[PDB]
Paper text:
The LytR-CpsA-Psr (LCP) (LytR - autolysin regulator; CpsA–capsule-associated protein A and Psr–penicillin-binding protein regulator) is a family of enzymes responsible for the last step of the assembly of WTA and other cell wall glycopolymers. LytR and other members of the LCP family have been described as pyrophosphatases. They cleave the pyrophosphate bond in glycopolymers precursors. In this work, we studied the LytR protein from the Gram-positive bacterium Streptococcus dysgalactiae subsp. dysgalactiae (SDSD), a known animal pathogen and one of the leading causes of bovine mastitis and fish streptococcosis.
In this study, the structure of the LCP domain of LytR protein from S. dysgalactiae subsp. dysgalactiae was determined at 2.80 Å, confirming that despite low sequence homology with other LCP-family members, the overall structure is highly conserved. Analysis of the electron density maps suggests the presence of three sulphate ions at the surface of the protein. No electron density was observed at the active site that could correspond to bound substrates. The regions S48-Q56, G70-Q77, and N335-S342 are highly disordered, with no interpretable electron density in the 2Fo-Fc map. The structure is composed of 8 α-helices alternated with 12 β-sheets in a 3-layer (αβα) sandwich architecture. The characteristic central six-stranded β-sheet is sandwiched between the α-helices and the double-stranded antiparallel β-sheets (β4-β5, β7-β8 and β11-β12). LytR LCP domain contains a long and narrow pocket located between the central β-strand and the α-helices 3 to 7, near the N-terminus. The presence of this pocket is extremely conserved in the LCP family of proteins corresponding to the binding site of the undecaprenyl units - the hydrophobic section - of the physiological substrates. The binding site of LCP proteins is composed of conserved positive and negatively charged residues: two aspartates (D68 and D83 for SDSD LytR) coordinate the Mg2+ cofactor and are present in all members of the family identified so far, except for just two cases. The positive charges come from four conserved arginines (R154, R210, R212 and R222 for SDSD LytR) that are expected to interact with the pyrophosphate group present in the native substrates.
Residue numbers in the entry: 57 to 69, 78 to 334
Amino acid sequence: TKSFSILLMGVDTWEGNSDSMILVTVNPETKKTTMTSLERDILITLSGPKNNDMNGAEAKLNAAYAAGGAQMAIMTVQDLLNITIDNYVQINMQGLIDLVDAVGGITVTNEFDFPISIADNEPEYQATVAPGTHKVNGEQALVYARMRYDDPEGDYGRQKRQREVIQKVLKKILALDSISSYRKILSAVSGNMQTNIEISSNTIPGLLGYRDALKTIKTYQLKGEDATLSDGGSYQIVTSDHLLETQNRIRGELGLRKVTQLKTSATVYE
């Protein structure tokens, strides 16, 4: 019954590439969970083992994972937000499909006037989401989550959608009453999910002591301005203003002191 922080990472497979970085704050006391999406494109100074060539390099946040696995991603995001992160959870795409299936599916709304597909690009995922509101399986949930319009305005939507999927999966998990139910869900994702959190017969029930925090899930996005790179690629500097409100929002939920200055490994305009 204490507030804790977890860094959620989707990974194309445990070395591979970060497809998502969500900081989740769980407060059982306030009965509130916050999910803040961190832009893969933010420019930042990476933090890793000193053993590592990329420790100290200024790069996009996406690159922490690519250089030193989940260890570097945590070190890097710790220095981005000036808060200590208690645990991490990597899931890959098979993971995400298995999990959505294991909770009985979810309901999403395709806002557009055309079905959503990604097979043209990635033919391993031939699923599709009709327009309107429909119950969706794991294969259809991944596709909704991974669809990028490949526009400067692509991730923003992709990130809202990724958050949605997780939130909806989490609402299904609240409504579970059995420990077996939960045991079956950790079975379902066994191969395709990895974490600091201890998984045993000891912990599956210890976990249900936090379900109360799923009663209110507020979603958020850390953002700034889209700029250009010499290769023609795209990055984003964080407006120091937006950055602090973000460290303070999270710190609050995690039961901590509001900060006065802005200590960050990130590259602000100033």
